[PDB]
Amino acid sequence: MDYDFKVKLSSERERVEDLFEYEGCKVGRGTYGHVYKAKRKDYALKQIEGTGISMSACREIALLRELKHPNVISLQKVFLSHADRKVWLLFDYAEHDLWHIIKFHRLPRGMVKSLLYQILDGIHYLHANWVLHRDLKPANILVMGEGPERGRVKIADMGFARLFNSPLKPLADLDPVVVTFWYRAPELLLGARHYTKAIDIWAIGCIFAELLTSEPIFHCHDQLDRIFNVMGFPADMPEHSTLMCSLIKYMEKHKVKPDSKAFHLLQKLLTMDPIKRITSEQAMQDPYFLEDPLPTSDVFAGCQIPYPKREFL
């Protein structure tokens, strides 16, 4: 570890502040880090919380290095500053976040049809590469706008994503909490320590119901009561006794027809057991997408976007 190697590396390196106007105009704040709009001297520049590299940063870097897909976010470059020992990532800018669409409408059917189809194919591709997202929220789904590609939802912010190819330790021994309680699957909420890949299916079903009713289906034992209320109690894994019809009426209250094609898929997406839950590939085979309107690559399909651009903080 000598001076000449350091000076040569510094000469080879390029400074992030010397190339991008990341200062100011912060566009997103969260527990993952800070997201800014940046341009060369538009991209989303993300600074990760915490000095040095943490488990989230290491997983992020080791996962999006080798994953490539039209429906999956892809970083273009990474910067590593030694003065303060923190990490900077550079994704392509995604103007519209699904949370913004949900909030603005509080709605074409083909739009939600295509959006669900695209998220299902993306999560199927993710499951193909033998990895678990372990976090699906409406704020983690981003939509391109008025660019070279329209629509084309992108899954991102997979800091909690972990490979499940072969577990050296149980998946719950190093992460008691994997996702927010609004979308926690019943299996892990019942204290399961080894959970399969079906949790993401439950999450996508929950968010699909949220877009169907334009209102959070699950709102706040804090969520177990709501889970039992929304779709009844299972009368047909651990702490079974320690815990101490409704779905149809709940969907009817939101002016959704009980007898339709979307309702059957939504009902079959959410089950109390992992074995009977459908996997990603069978979701596309559901003739729900087949019925008109057929899913589109462009969600807007030529319509003007009424949602405003993301605002600064």
């Binding site: 199927h124 591709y125 596309m284 057929l294």
Partner: peptide, 16 residues
């Protein structure tokens, strides 16, 4: 933007 036959099969990916 209509793809009748493409609905059944998922996209393989960007690949190389």
């Amino acid at each position: 933007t209509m793809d009748r036959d493409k609905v059944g099969i998922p996209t393989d990916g960007d690949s190389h």
